[PDB]
């Protein structure tokens with residue numbers, strides 16, 4: 001029985017999604033698993049997307065200020081985890097920021113900054129504490145979500161890829177697979193060990209924040225771990241010499257002014273790594289270190305504008321610098 005390596009990639013959830021698997025199972029079993037991975041990603045785009053009119057999320061947003069809406073258990077659990085990270089991060093990560101994001105968004109398409117007052121009004125509609133999750137305790141009791149504040153809008157952009165990466169890992173595992181690299185628009189989950197039959201940790205790349213993306217600046221060897229990076233240059237537009245990126249500081253309503261160029265979070269669950277990466281980017285380095293003390297099972301790697309790199313204890317020894325312009329502090 002021989003080891004074989006498979007990959008498959010498709011444009012879905014608005015980005016390139018790729019899954020690579022090593023397996024000794026019959027090829028047909030791997031093919032079935034990958035078929036289901038990409039079916040899932042198609043189905044979940046229609047549940048979670050904040051920028052399609054026809055998604056379950058859009059439907060829920062349409063009911064802001066009205067009666068509770070029934071949701072499936074999966075979406076409920078994701079919202080629960082998002083609100084947990086909102087609270088722990090003091091709202092640096094905020095899953096109800098749609099009123100503001102949507103105002104900037106159109107800025108992106110047609111390169112214009114929002115309007116002062118319009119922006120201030122939108123900020124009044126982003127209180128994630130007004131998202132009420134209820135689930136009864138009896139058999140088959142429904143799960144519901146109520147957006148209490150009129151005009152408030154969920155946007156799960158900062159946690160949905162993490163959630164989907166976790167869902168994919170669970171799916172692979174259900175198909176008796178135990179070696180894969182899941183890559184959803186750069187949101188990585190390294191499942192198990194790869195093959196060289198020599199077994200090796202996955203070598204996960206981290207990009208130069210100002211690079212053309214082609215080559216990684218650094219690589220970190222990991223097993224059974226998500227690696228998710230948030231950065232100031234993954235998405236932005238420029239107007240009159242100022243750059244405006246996609247990660248909003250909920251206090252200002254503007255793209256976060258922060259002291260790091262990127263933050264990469266290493267965690268057993270990609271949902272958690274994704275939420276934390278965004279929170280940390282917003283909070284900046286010192287406040288991130290403080291927040292991260294709450295989550296002992298997580299590691300983090302910060303790339304600074306001066307190309308210094310700092311990594312926490314659990315991963316620093318597994319980091320290798322590939323672009324010598326960067327320096328790993330020890």
Ligand SMILES: Nc1ncnc2c1ncn2[C@@H]1O[C@H](COP(=O)(O)O)[C@@H](O)[C@H]1O
Nearest residue numbers: 092093094095157158230246247248278
């Ligand atoms: N502070 C924030 N908290 C949560 N979601 C955000 C925030 N700022 C922007 N977003 C949304 O989440 C995306 C960024 O997620 P990420 O790339 O995971 O940091 C943005 O493109 C927005 O859709």
Ligand SMILES: [Mg+2]
Nearest residue numbers: 158274275278
């Ligand atoms: Mg995120």
Ligand SMILES: [Mn+2]
Nearest residue numbers: 158159161274
């Ligand atoms: Mn992300």
